[PDB]
Write a protein that binds this ligand. Structure first.
Ligand SMILES: *CC(=O)N(c1ccc(C(C)(C)C)cc1)[C@@H](C(=O)NC(C)(C)C)c1cccnc1
Ligand SMILES: *CC(=O)N(c1ccc(C(C)(C)C)cc1)[C@@H](C(=O)NC(C)(C)C)c1cccnc1
Lengths: 305, 305
């Protein structure tokens, strides 16, 4: 029993973290096979910070301007290329610790683990969700860019996030491993505000199922509702709309707890309309929305990797 | 910026997790050098649970009854011994991945990272505190016994916890790596009282400093207090008494933020007496006590390993 915010074991990603230094700027890169991936703003100077011409800065750089360090092993860069907002440094050595991996682009609401890193070295691991407004509420200091987010399915690491920047509000913005920003953000020091984030409804419901599984059941009521009536309530409380897909996704938890999804929707509706009355659910006084249905199952079922 | 419950990178521990099988029951072991550490109750069976005679049960076993698997590779057990509540299987082979390590017995209120494992395979990593009553509020299912908790200091893994059991109460009990239980618990299937818990005051204050460092400052008050006055309040709200030692441990945070320790206590006193009025501190509606002052500094300074 018990329910905690659990990250994937980070070993397979730790062996891929390197340090990338171009001129005065050092950040983290991802070493897979003979390629190092890192944010393109490594080639920026403090001058270009407000609006850099990335094509200009790049074409002028050559292979030896990039210092890549895997632990104490210096890698020799034998090629470089820019793909969207990431740099791909070709190195002379394939990473002997390269795991089975894929690059994926996650949807809002999906969770992943972040291995926060500085100067190529791992600092700690925690779980994040891609917020509906395409930011993440992470823990990133200066030099953390290039840290990555990932999921692990048995032996295969699915890289989904590379960290690039903090917004003025303290939230975090980044790309997939093809360099495409999540959300409308760009890699310059400009005026870019996240936008109103909403609550991931299907996740709150999964966590409510998790609560029931662990014996917290006070919030359960004698009411049901409809998807339409519930969506009216979710919209008033800045909750993502619930779809038939979300309902289908919640089947497994519904069949384990014997609690119909619409019945749990009626519970969540009462919790949104009346608040929590100073009670706690799974040790929290807020409705928690950073567990997917897969997370709840995996944590209540023991899936390993 | 930002602040999350952050675990140490788990890689060094991942290469140490093996599967130990003795007859019917299989659990997780810790393979360091040529020794595999696991809960001695792996030698129990169905009828032995309520009050096993471990000395007697161990006698009925010899080396070949203990199946150790490190991945698909089989380890040959060549010696076996009981140390308090842990079995020590001496094996044919030193773990080539053995990190630099120590065994330590931590103090209540200290934190560590847990690498939750099933069948010798890691499934996730999370941070938690040794409660004042020597339990931990973890996430552990059947077969998770043998999973370990640890801290890392640069390159040395300090193993401090091995998981043994869930109390019917839902919290978790285990031992140091010499097999001595934290708290009054015994490794038998019997009802066992954990005893009154307390909130870890110094950690709450450390987390309030973390909050200030991250821009949540609404709770900072126009008031002060005294150690004895604060402790009268702390004891009413089931908080650990604050000592000068705790004050001194808070010195660096107080120095960084410019807020005297006894002033932050005045802030904490009023949160305790009045609640949060539906405000959140670092995304929480409860006062968090699972961050040590060192945890905060490490996270807000980007310490690396
Ligand atoms: C990479 C990094 O850590 N940055 C960062 C530097 C430079 C940029 C641009 C503007 C694209 C050149 C973006 C990010 C840190 C930083 O220096 N500044 C801001 C606040 C992100 C603009 C940083 C600090 C904290 C968290 N993430 C990133
Ligand atoms: C090892 C394990 O996962 N146990 C467990 C088995 C056997 C024992 C004793 C009674 C000491 C032989 C202790 C723990 C799980 C379990 O089956 N039962 C209890 C309730 C913990 C006693 C278990 C399940 C969940 C979390 N931890 C352990």
């Amino acid at each position: 029993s018990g329910f905690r915010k659990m990250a994937f074991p980070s070993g397979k990603v730790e062996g891929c973290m390197v340090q990338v230094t171009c001129g005065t700027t050092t950040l983290n890169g991802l070493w897979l096979d003979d390629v190092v991936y890192c944010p393109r703003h490594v080639i920026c100077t403090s001058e270009d910070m407000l609006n850099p011409n990335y094509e200009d800065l790049l074409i002028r750089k050559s292979n030896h301007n990039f210092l890549v360090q895997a632990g104490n092993v210096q890698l020799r860069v034998i090629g470089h290329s820019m793909q969207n907002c990431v740099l791909k440094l070709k190195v002379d050595t394939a990473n002997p610790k390269t795991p089975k991996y894929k690059f994926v682009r996650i949807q809002p609401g999906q969770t992943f683990s972040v291995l926060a890193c500085y100067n190529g070295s791992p600092s700690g691991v925690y779980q994040c969700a891609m917020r509906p407004n395409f930011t993440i509420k992470g823990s990133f200091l200066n030099g953390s860019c290039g840290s990555v987010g990932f999921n692990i399915d048995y032996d295969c690491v699915s890289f989904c996030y590379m960290h690039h920047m903090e917004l003025p509000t303290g939230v975090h913005a980044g790309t997939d491993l093809e360099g495409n920003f999540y959300g409308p953000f760009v890699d310059r020091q400009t005026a870019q505000a996240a936008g109103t984030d909403t609550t991931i409804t299907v996740n709150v419901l999964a966590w409510l199922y998790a609560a029931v599984i662990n014996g917290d059941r006070w919030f359960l009521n004698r009411f049901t509702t409809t998807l339409n009536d519930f969506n009216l309530v979710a919209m008033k409380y800045n909750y993502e709309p619930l779809t038939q897909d979300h309902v289908d996704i919640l089947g497994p938890l519904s069949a384990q707890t014997g609690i119909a999804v619409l019945d749990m929707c009626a519970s969540l509706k009462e919790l949104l309309q009346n608040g929590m009355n100073g009670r706690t659910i799974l040790g929290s006084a807020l409705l928690e929305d950073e567990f997917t249905p897969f997370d709840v199952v995996r944590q209540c079922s023991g899936v390993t990797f």
